[PDB]
């Protein structure tokens, strides 16, 4: 006995606009390749190669750059340094 009001008249959602001629000839193989590449994160798994790249780029490389950047802080001063003078401050 519980039904929406008869007073309501519902029509279609049409989006309007001019249907242009279809200027691209879709290739199903390319679309599937694109979809696989686009949503690669949904299927990523930790393996030996993937873990190796992770531990290289997220750990080893930052550690190298951090050691360089904290070891060399304030080390060099070059402005107008002349012969015999030390370009190093420590």
């Amino acid at each position: 006995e519980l039904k929406p009001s008869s007073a309501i008249q519902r029509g279609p959602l049409n989006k309007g606009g001019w249907d242009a001629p279809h200027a691209l000839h879709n290739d199903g193989a390319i679309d599937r390749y694109a979809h696989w590449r686009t949503f690669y994160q949904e299927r990523f798994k930790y393996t030996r190669a993937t873990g190796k790249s992770t531990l290289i780029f997220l750990v080893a490389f930052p550690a190298l750059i951090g050691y360089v950047a904290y070891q060399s802080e304030g080390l060099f001063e070059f402005a107008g340094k002349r012969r015999g003078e030390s370009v190093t401050t420590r």
Binding site: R32, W36, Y40, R43, F44, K45, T47, A49, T50
Partner: peptide, 26 residues
Amino acid sequence: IRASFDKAEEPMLGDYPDIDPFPAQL
């Protein structure tokens, strides 16, 4: 299939064709 980096991706595909890649230049 042939190369190490393509082999690395085999667990990461699910229901996508495991194609043997051939250089299109060859």
